[PDB]
């Protein structure tokens, strides 16, 4: 187990067929989780499960460019549960990130930041116990 926030380096950025796996357990009474794939200060892909946004659960996805958030993409399908272990898998594809949670497909997010080879850090934050963060090619 590791303590969050945690920064996972992605040396040389990301590339298609790179699979990033984040394992952890959601705390009881969690409010939020955040994964931030960063190109310097820009956030290419922000993946933000919110456990209570207006009394519902939603996943918010976005990009931050020059410190400004863009247009959000929201997913109501919500595979996380307070107190339960999870696996987030982010598969880099040519035109999008593909996310699966607990071995079930969840969402795709098209690349807004084009320079994949400069998306060189993944930040992991929020109401979790972090078990592991790693990557491999498939
Ligand atoms: C016009 C406008 C008005 C309001 C908003 S709200 C905004 O929405 C964004 C996604 O579009 C991001 O989610 C932002 N955000 C969340 C975290 C964060 C964090 F700082 C942590 F320390 C965590 O542990 C954690 F899990 C987090 F999520 N940082 N920035 C959010 O402030 C947008 C536009």
Q: Is 72 annotated as a binding residue?
A: yes
d(CA 57, CA 86): 16
Structure's resolution in angstroms: 1.2
HSE-CB of 120 using CA atoms within 13 angstroms: 7
Q: Is the CB of 27 under 6 A from ligand 1?
A: no
Q: Is 81 annotated as a binding residue?
A: no
d(CA 45, CA 108): 11
1-138 folds as Jelly Rolls (2.60.120)
d(CA 126, CA 120): 20
- C-beta separation of 110 from 96 below 8 A: yes
Please indicate the experimental technique that yielded this structure. X-ray
d(CA 84, CA 80): 7
d(CA 62, CA 70): 6
**Distance (Å) from CA 138 to ligand 1 centroid:** 31
């Amino acid at each position: 187990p590791l303590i969050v926030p945690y920064n996972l380096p992605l040396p040389g950025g990301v590339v298609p067929r790179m699979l990033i796996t984040i394992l952890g357990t959601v705390k009881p009474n969690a409010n939020r989780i955040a994964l931030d794939f960063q190109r310097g200060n820009d956030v290419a892909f922000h993946f933000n499960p919110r456990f209570n946004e207006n009394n519902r659960r939603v996943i918010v996805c976005n990009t931050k460019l020059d410190n400004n958030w863009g247009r959000e993409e929201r997913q109501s399908v919500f595979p996380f549960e307070s107190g339960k272990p999870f696996k987030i898998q982010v598969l880099v594809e040519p035109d999008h990130f593909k996310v699966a949670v607990n071995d079930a497909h969840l969402l795709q997010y098209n690349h807004r930041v084009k320079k994949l080879n400069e998306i060189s850090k993944l930040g992991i934050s929020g109401d979790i116990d972090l078990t592991s963060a790693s990557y491999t090619m498939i």
